[PDB]
Structure 1
Amino acid sequence: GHMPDLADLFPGFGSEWINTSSGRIFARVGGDGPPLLLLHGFPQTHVMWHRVAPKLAERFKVIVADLPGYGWSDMPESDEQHTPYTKRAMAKQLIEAMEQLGHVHFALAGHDRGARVSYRLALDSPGRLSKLAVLDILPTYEYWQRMNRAYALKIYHWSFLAQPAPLPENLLGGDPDFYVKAKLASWTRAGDLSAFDPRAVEHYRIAFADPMRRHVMCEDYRAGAYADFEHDKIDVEAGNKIPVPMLALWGASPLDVWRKWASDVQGAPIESGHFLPEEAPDQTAEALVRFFSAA
């Protein structure tokens, strides 16, 4: 009874609680063949890939993991530098998890915060990856460098969530169900929850209802403002590029920027707002299947 019995949106996938030095990672695992790790972002959990994972599982062993501190993954204790929720740390932790499942090398697709873990994994540890896909992001450095009135208004959560504790936590506690649903709706093409399966929304809501989980989200954004930015800035200053074959997808509702950060990148627009795998599952799955099958 320690865990809620939430809807199973991955028919035929197993569940794994995977040990790491920083705590357990929860993942759904399905299909067969070369490993493909899929990483969600904010304010979601692993279930965001439920529409695309079955298609990918035709050809790959699909591992659909909750980020450190998200969903059902354990929440390592943070520190003043937000270390465990930096993308650098998260990437190392997910490397440990993949090794547990038997995979020293793997393919990787990330959305939103998961995409940030992914490109950072690729900068830090490019030998681990065969191919990388990033969905609907630019690097953290780029979002901060382009900070201005327009961006401040559009990605206000980058500055609000990064305020020192307990400011955002105290505020999010006063109607979390509203916040999580507003955050999802606001970044869809439709501006409502129509693109999401209601059962997925319930996963997202249940996670966001726990104050400890909301604290981790804020630690993630604090890292995003400070250590993750600094990590990125070091790469920019040395002109470091990802050498891994890369695919950037983005919602038409970015390749030039990615070509500054990667020496082998393909890209495509998807008719979607932010949540590509749920708003445009067929187009997203087709793009990923093609890219990861070329190897």
Structure 2
Amino acid sequence: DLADLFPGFGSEWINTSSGRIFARVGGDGPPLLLLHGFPQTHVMWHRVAPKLAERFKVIVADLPGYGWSDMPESDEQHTPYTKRAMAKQLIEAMEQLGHVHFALAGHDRGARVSYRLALDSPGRLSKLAVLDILPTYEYWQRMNRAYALKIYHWSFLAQPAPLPENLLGGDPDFYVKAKLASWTRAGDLSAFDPRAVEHYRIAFADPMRRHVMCEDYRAGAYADFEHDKIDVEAGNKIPVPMLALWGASGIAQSAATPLDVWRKWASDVQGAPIESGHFLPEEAPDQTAEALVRFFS
């Protein structure tokens, strides 16, 4: 059975034209949407959301297809799991709550939804924070031996179905724990709350949920890359003030120097490293929360 890691947050199923979005909602004040990434669910914000809820209406959503959100049927171009489509669905979800102008922080895949949202629909955002990513175009453009070995799962999970699905089925508990462990600074599971790990393990135990994750990565290798490429070539920059945080031992800093990269993508960007591996809000909840509150306030 799955622990409630957001005491005092409500639980909402938000209807959209592509399916329900699950969210925990707490706090009051300006709306702030928090988006998780792979292979996690909304519960990864559990150490940081209570501090944000002191000043904001905090909406902690499962991405489309992840966690308890509905899984829209995919197609040959992985359309519902492109970050453009995810952002449109989340915009529609926020409109259901009456939030048409809101603050947004995302981590990993959710940070990819977030900067794509800022490029497509900048009027929707007051401020944007992205945690431990560079834009998808930048990862692929920096693909070399070292990066290919480090983020091998970018090409592995993008392989045509059912290859990754079948292999992930070989040992799904091991795989999700291996990914969680290996991207931390400690290299084991000791930075995570065990009840959160159980949430991530249970979601990953569902074949349909694993398939959606592969569809996300397929979108990441194809349409998401092409969407980013158009913006790069057009010189389109994110106009929303943004914060780029990265782990000193994280994924973003192995590809490049992250604030220099983001300055090419955003007109108004601040940045700071956090002493952390990839999972900033769980490995370094206090430093992450402080930086987010300061930026959004």
Which residue number in structure 2 is paired with residue 210 of structure 1?
206
Task: Give the drift of 1:6.
Answer: 1.4
Task: Give the drift of 1:218.
Answer: 0.1
Q: Give me the whole-angstrom Cα distance separating, in 2, the residues matched to 1:127 and 1:192.
A: 41
Residue by residue over 1:181-208, the C-alpha shift from the partner in whole angstroms, topping out at 9 and shown as x without a partner, is: 0000010000000000000000000000
Q: Mind listing any 5+ residue stretches in structure 2 that lack a counterpart?
A: 249-256
Which residue number in structure 2 is paired with residue 82 of structure 1?
78
Residue by residue over 1:139-167, the C-alpha shift from the partner in whole angstroms, topping out at 9 and shown as x without a partner, is: 00000000000010000000000000000
Task: Give the drift of 1:239.
Answer: 0.6
Residue by residue over 1:220-254, the C-alpha shift from the partner in whole angstroms, topping out at 9 and shown as x without a partner, is: 00000000000000001101000000000000090
Q: Give me the whole-angstrom Cα distance separating, in 1, the residues matched to 2:56 and 2:162.
A: 42
Residue by residue over 1:253-285, the C-alpha shift from the partner in whole angstroms, topping out at 9 and shown as x without a partner, is: 900000000000000000000000000000000
SS of residue matched to 2:119 = helix
Task: Give the drift of 1:102.
Answer: 1.4
SS of residue matched to 2:264 = helix
Q: Give me the whole-angstrom Cα distance separating, in 2, the residues matched to 1:61 and 1:102.
A: 12
Residue by residue over 1:68-90, the C-alpha shift from the partner in whole angstroms, topping out at 9 and shown as x without a partner, is: 00000000000000000000000
Task: Give the drift of 1:171.
Answer: 0.4
Task: Give the drift of 1:137.
Answer: 0.2
Task: Give the drift of 1:7.
Answer: 0.7
SS of residue matched to 1:114 = helix
Which residue number in structure 1 is paired with residue 194 of structure 2?
198
Q: Give me the whole-angstrom Cα distance separating, in 2, the residues matched to 1:7 and 1:228.
A: 34
Q: Give me the whole-angstrom Cα distance separating, in 2, the residues matched to 1:8 and 1:142.
A: 37
Q: Give me the whole-angstrom Cα distance separating, in 2, the residues matched to 1:102 and 1:182.
A: 40
SS of residue matched to 2:6 = coil
Identical columns (%): 100
- Residue 25 of structure 2 corresponds to residue 29 of structure 1: yes
Q: Give me the whole-angstrom Cα distance separating, in 2, the residues matched to 1:121 and 1:246.
A: 13
Task: Give the drift of 1:174.
Answer: 1.2
Task: Give the drift of 1:19.
Answer: 0.2
Q: Give me the whole-angstrom Cα distance separating, in 2, the residues matched to 1:108 and 1:129.
A: 7
Q: Give me the whole-angstrom Cα distance separating, in 1, the residues matched to 2:90 and 2:171.
A: 32
SS of residue matched to 1:261 = coil
Which residue number in structure 2 is paired with residue 265 of structure 1?
269
Q: Give me the whole-angstrom Cα distance separating, in 2, the residues matched to 1:30 and 1:71.
A: 19
Q: Give me the whole-angstrom Cα distance separating, in 2, the residues matched to 1:243 and 1:137.
A: 18
Which residue number in structure 1 is paired with residue 37 of structure 2?
41
Q: Mind listing any 5+ residue stretches in structure 1 that lack a counterpart?
A: none
Number of residues paired by the alignment? 289
Q: Give me the whole-angstrom Cα distance separating, in 2, the residues matched to 1:269 and 1:172.
A: 32
Q: Give me the whole-angstrom Cα distance separating, in 2, the residues matched to 1:99 and 1:16.
A: 14
Q: Give me the whole-angstrom Cα distance separating, in 2, the residues matched to 1:270 and 1:118.
A: 20
- Residue 286 of structure 2 corresponds to residue 282 of structure 1: yes
Residue by residue over 1:118-155, the C-alpha shift from the partner in whole angstroms, topping out at 9 and shown as x without a partner, is: 00000000000000000000000000000000010000
Superposition CA RMSD, Å: 0.9
Which residue number in structure 1 is paired with residue 12 of structure 2?
16
Task: Give the drift of 1:116.
Answer: 0.1
Structure 1 stretches of at least 4 aligned residues deviating more than 2 Å after TM superposition? none
Task: Give the drift of 1:58.
Answer: 0.3
Q: Give me the whole-angstrom Cα distance separating, in 1, the residues matched to 2:100 and 2:133.
A: 26
Task: Give the drift of 1:22.
Answer: 0.3
Q: Give me the whole-angstrom Cα distance separating, in 2, the residues matched to 1:288 and 1:112.
A: 16
Task: Give the drift of 1:101.
Answer: 1.1
Residue by residue over 1:40-62, the C-alpha shift from the partner in whole angstroms, topping out at 9 and shown as x without a partner, is: 00000000000000000000000
Q: Give me the whole-angstrom Cα distance separating, in 2, the residues matched to 1:21 and 1:7.
A: 30
Q: Give me the whole-angstrom Cα distance separating, in 1, the residues matched to 2:284 and 2:156.
A: 29
Q: Give me the whole-angstrom Cα distance separating, in 1, the residues matched to 2:228 and 2:146.
A: 22
Q: Give me the whole-angstrom Cα distance separating, in 1, the residues matched to 2:289 and 2:155.
A: 32
Q: Structure 2-normalised TM-score?
A: 0.97
SS of residue matched to 1:150 = helix
Q: Give me the whole-angstrom Cα distance separating, in 2, the residues matched to 1:213 and 1:88.
A: 20
Task: Give the drift of 1:112.
Answer: 0.2
Q: Structure 1-normalised TM-score?
A: 0.97
Q: Give me the whole-angstrom Cα distance separating, in 1, the residues matched to 2:236 and 2:99.
A: 26
